[PDB]
Amino acid sequence: EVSAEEIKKHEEKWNKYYGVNAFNLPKELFSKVDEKDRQKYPYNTIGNVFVKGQTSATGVLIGKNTVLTNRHIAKFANGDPSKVSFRPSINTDDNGNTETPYGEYEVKEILQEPFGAGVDLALIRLKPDQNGVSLGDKISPAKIGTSNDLKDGDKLELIGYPFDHKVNQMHRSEIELTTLSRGLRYYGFTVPGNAGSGIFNSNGELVGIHSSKVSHLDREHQINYGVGIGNYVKRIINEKNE
């Protein structure tokens, strides 16, 4: 039971992201990443995880051949790697011109729930290109930070592919952390395609991965939910990354 004032104020914040049209959102909270920034770190570590005829979400390159995304996204492939494709820094302008600066990568192995069925993270291992060159040799993987030092009120950058808004167009969303006692929760604009988006701190370190929206305060309100890179997650990553 939370005071009726909290709900009133929550609806306040939440509304500044979902009350107005996505296109009429302030640049500071939600904006497309231009060609220039897309070639720079950490933006170039972001890619589109494409599951043929299932979904189109986001993923972060965290190793030479490893992509970190959500378990719920990886489940759509039903264990079959050939159903998943990773397209780093892909971009499709409003006129249909699609470009993939680093090519498209095939998946050799899917680790659906290496952190546990209750942690919405999965690892995707990619095959090198036909010349045997790993994506991680073309682009430096994201630096892995920690979520242990974050605190209520903190502002972070969420980078991903908001498919439902614009197809194959990388966007950044400013997020504001809230009640962290119940997990990584935050205010910000996201759509289903943002699943797997990287959350970076001012130091450019990856501190979390966006997951989805969950009930908040009561059973009738929402908030964004992500998975923080805590002690347990880092251990597993360091153990299976490659």
Coordinates of C-alpha atoms in Angstrom, one line a residue:
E1 CA 0.0 0.0 0.0
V2 CA 1.5 3.3 -1.2
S3 CA 0.0 6.7 -0.6
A4 CA -2.4 8.1 -3.2
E5 CA 0.1 11.0 -3.6
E6 CA 2.7 8.7 -5.0
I7 CA 0.4 7.3 -7.7
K8 CA -0.6 10.9 -8.5
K9 CA 3.1 11.9 -9.0
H10 CA 4.0 8.7 -10.7
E11 CA 1.3 9.3 -13.3
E12 CA 2.9 12.7 -13.6
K13 CA 6.4 11.6 -14.6
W14 CA 5.2 8.6 -16.6
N15 CA 2.9 10.9 -18.5
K16 CA 5.8 13.2 -19.7
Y17 CA 7.0 10.2 -21.7
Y18 CA 3.8 8.6 -22.7
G19 CA 1.3 11.5 -22.6
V20 CA 2.5 13.3 -25.7
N21 CA 3.2 11.7 -29.1
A22 CA 6.5 9.9 -29.5
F23 CA 7.5 12.3 -32.3
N24 CA 6.7 15.3 -30.2
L25 CA 9.0 14.2 -27.4
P26 CA 11.8 16.5 -26.3
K27 CA 15.2 15.8 -27.9
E28 CA 16.8 15.5 -24.4
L29 CA 14.6 12.5 -23.4
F30 CA 14.3 10.7 -26.8
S31 CA 16.3 11.1 -30.0
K32 CA 17.7 9.3 -33.0
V33 CA 21.4 8.7 -33.0
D34 CA 22.9 10.3 -36.1
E35 CA 25.5 8.7 -38.5
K36 CA 28.4 10.4 -36.7
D37 CA 27.6 9.2 -33.2
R38 CA 26.7 5.8 -34.5
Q39 CA 30.3 5.1 -35.5
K40 CA 31.5 6.0 -32.0
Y41 CA 31.6 4.1 -28.7
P42 CA 29.3 3.1 -27.0
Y43 CA 26.8 3.5 -29.8
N44 CA 28.6 1.1 -32.2
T45 CA 28.3 -1.7 -29.6
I46 CA 24.5 -1.6 -30.2
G47 CA 22.9 -3.9 -32.8
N48 CA 19.6 -5.3 -33.9
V49 CA 18.8 -8.9 -32.9
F50 CA 16.5 -10.2 -35.7
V51 CA 14.5 -13.4 -35.3
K52 CA 12.9 -14.2 -38.6
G53 CA 9.2 -13.8 -38.5
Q54 CA 9.1 -13.5 -34.7
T55 CA 10.6 -10.3 -33.5
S56 CA 13.2 -7.5 -34.0
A57 CA 14.8 -6.3 -30.8
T58 CA 18.1 -5.0 -29.4
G59 CA 21.4 -6.6 -28.3
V60 CA 24.8 -5.3 -27.0
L61 CA 28.2 -6.6 -28.1
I62 CA 30.0 -7.5 -24.9
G63 CA 32.7 -9.8 -26.2
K64 CA 34.6 -10.6 -29.3
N65 CA 31.8 -12.9 -30.5
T66 CA 29.2 -12.4 -27.7
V67 CA 26.0 -10.4 -27.7
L68 CA 23.9 -9.8 -24.5
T69 CA 20.1 -9.6 -24.9
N70 CA 17.0 -10.7 -23.2
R71 CA 16.0 -14.2 -22.4
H72 CA 12.4 -13.5 -23.6
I73 CA 13.8 -12.4 -26.9
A74 CA 16.1 -15.4 -27.4
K75 CA 13.2 -17.7 -26.6
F76 CA 11.5 -16.8 -29.9
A77 CA 14.2 -18.8 -31.8
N78 CA 13.3 -22.0 -29.9
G79 CA 17.0 -23.0 -29.5
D80 CA 17.6 -22.9 -33.3
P81 CA 20.5 -20.4 -34.0
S82 CA 19.7 -20.1 -37.7
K83 CA 16.6 -18.2 -36.8
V84 CA 18.6 -15.4 -35.2
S85 CA 20.6 -12.7 -36.9
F86 CA 22.6 -9.8 -35.4
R87 CA 22.9 -6.6 -37.4
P88 CA 25.3 -4.1 -35.6
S89 CA 24.6 -0.4 -36.2
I90 CA 22.1 -1.2 -38.9
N91 CA 20.2 1.8 -40.2
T92 CA 17.2 2.2 -42.5
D93 CA 16.3 5.7 -43.4
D94 CA 12.8 6.9 -43.9
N95 CA 13.2 6.1 -47.6
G96 CA 14.0 2.4 -47.4
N97 CA 17.7 2.7 -47.8
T98 CA 19.1 0.1 -45.4
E99 CA 22.8 0.0 -44.5
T100 CA 24.8 -2.5 -42.4
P101 CA 28.3 -1.0 -42.0
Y102 CA 29.8 -4.1 -40.4
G103 CA 27.7 -6.6 -42.3
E104 CA 25.2 -9.1 -40.8
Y105 CA 26.2 -11.8 -38.4
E106 CA 25.0 -15.4 -38.1
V107 CA 24.6 -17.0 -34.7
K108 CA 26.3 -20.3 -33.8
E109 CA 25.0 -20.8 -30.3
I110 CA 22.2 -19.5 -28.1
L111 CA 22.6 -19.6 -24.3
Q112 CA 18.9 -19.0 -23.4
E113 CA 19.1 -18.6 -19.7
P114 CA 22.7 -18.9 -18.3
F115 CA 21.8 -16.6 -15.4
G116 CA 18.6 -18.4 -14.4
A117 CA 15.0 -18.6 -15.8
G118 CA 14.1 -15.7 -13.6
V119 CA 16.7 -13.3 -14.9
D120 CA 15.7 -11.9 -18.3
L121 CA 19.2 -12.1 -19.9
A122 CA 20.6 -14.4 -22.6
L123 CA 23.9 -14.8 -24.4
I124 CA 24.2 -15.0 -28.2
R125 CA 27.4 -16.3 -29.7
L126 CA 28.1 -15.2 -33.2
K127 CA 30.0 -16.8 -36.1
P128 CA 32.8 -14.7 -37.5
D129 CA 32.3 -13.2 -41.0
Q130 CA 33.1 -15.4 -44.0
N131 CA 36.7 -14.2 -43.8
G132 CA 36.8 -15.5 -40.3
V133 CA 36.8 -12.0 -38.7
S134 CA 34.9 -11.6 -35.5
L135 CA 32.6 -8.6 -34.9
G136 CA 34.7 -7.8 -31.8
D137 CA 37.8 -7.2 -34.0
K138 CA 36.0 -4.5 -36.0
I139 CA 34.3 -2.9 -33.0
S140 CA 35.5 -2.8 -29.4
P141 CA 33.0 -4.5 -27.1
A142 CA 31.1 -2.5 -24.5
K143 CA 33.0 -2.0 -21.2
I144 CA 31.1 -3.8 -18.4
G145 CA 30.5 -1.7 -15.4
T146 CA 28.4 -2.5 -12.3
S147 CA 24.9 -1.6 -11.1
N148 CA 25.9 -1.7 -7.4
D149 CA 26.6 2.1 -7.2
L150 CA 23.5 3.4 -8.9
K151 CA 20.9 5.2 -6.8
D152 CA 17.3 6.5 -6.9
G153 CA 17.2 9.6 -9.1
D154 CA 20.2 8.7 -11.2
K155 CA 20.0 9.6 -14.9
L156 CA 21.3 7.1 -17.4
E157 CA 21.4 6.6 -21.2
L158 CA 19.4 3.7 -22.8
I159 CA 20.5 3.0 -26.3
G160 CA 18.5 0.7 -28.6
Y161 CA 16.3 0.0 -31.6
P162 CA 12.7 1.1 -30.8
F163 CA 11.3 -1.0 -33.7
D164 CA 7.6 -0.2 -32.9
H165 CA 8.5 3.5 -33.4
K166 CA 10.9 3.5 -36.3
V167 CA 12.2 0.4 -38.0
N168 CA 16.0 -0.2 -37.8
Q169 CA 16.7 3.3 -36.4
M170 CA 19.0 3.6 -33.4
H171 CA 17.7 5.9 -30.7
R172 CA 18.8 7.0 -27.2
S173 CA 16.4 7.5 -24.3
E174 CA 17.3 9.2 -21.0
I175 CA 16.1 7.2 -18.1
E176 CA 15.7 8.1 -14.5
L177 CA 16.2 5.4 -11.8
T178 CA 13.5 5.0 -9.2
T179 CA 12.9 2.5 -6.3
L180 CA 15.9 0.3 -6.8
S181 CA 15.0 -2.0 -3.8
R182 CA 12.7 -4.0 -6.1
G183 CA 15.2 -4.2 -9.0
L184 CA 16.4 -1.9 -11.8
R185 CA 13.3 0.3 -12.3
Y186 CA 13.2 3.6 -14.2
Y187 CA 11.2 6.3 -16.0
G188 CA 11.8 6.7 -19.7
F189 CA 10.4 6.1 -23.2
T190 CA 10.7 2.6 -24.5
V191 CA 8.7 0.2 -26.8
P192 CA 8.8 -3.6 -27.1
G193 CA 11.8 -3.4 -29.6
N194 CA 13.9 -1.8 -27.0
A195 CA 14.1 -5.1 -25.3
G196 CA 17.8 -5.8 -24.9
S197 CA 18.9 -2.2 -25.0
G198 CA 22.1 -1.2 -23.3
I199 CA 22.0 1.1 -20.3
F200 CA 25.3 3.1 -19.9
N201 CA 26.5 5.5 -17.3
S202 CA 28.4 8.8 -17.8
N203 CA 31.6 6.9 -17.9
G204 CA 30.4 5.0 -20.9
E205 CA 30.1 1.7 -19.0
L206 CA 27.3 -0.8 -19.5
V207 CA 25.4 -1.1 -16.2
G208 CA 22.2 -2.8 -17.2
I209 CA 20.0 -4.2 -20.0
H210 CA 16.5 -3.1 -20.7
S211 CA 13.9 -5.8 -20.4
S212 CA 10.3 -4.5 -20.4
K213 CA 7.5 -2.9 -18.4
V214 CA 6.1 -4.3 -15.2
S215 CA 3.4 -3.3 -12.7
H216 CA 4.5 -0.6 -10.3
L217 CA 3.2 0.9 -7.0
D218 CA -0.2 -0.9 -7.5
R219 CA -1.6 -3.4 -10.0
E220 CA -2.8 -0.7 -12.3
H221 CA 0.4 1.3 -13.0
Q222 CA 3.6 0.7 -15.0
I223 CA 7.4 1.4 -14.9
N224 CA 10.4 0.3 -17.0
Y225 CA 12.2 -2.8 -15.8
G226 CA 15.8 -3.7 -16.6
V227 CA 18.4 -6.2 -15.4
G228 CA 21.4 -4.7 -13.6
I229 CA 24.9 -6.0 -14.1
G230 CA 25.3 -6.9 -10.4
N231 CA 27.9 -9.2 -8.8
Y232 CA 26.1 -12.4 -9.9
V233 CA 25.6 -11.3 -13.5
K234 CA 29.2 -10.1 -14.0
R235 CA 30.5 -13.5 -12.7
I236 CA 28.5 -15.4 -15.3
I237 CA 29.5 -13.0 -18.1
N238 CA 33.2 -13.2 -17.2
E239 CA 32.8 -17.0 -17.1
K240 CA 31.0 -17.5 -20.4
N241 CA 32.0 -14.4 -22.5
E242 CA 34.0 -14.7 -25.7

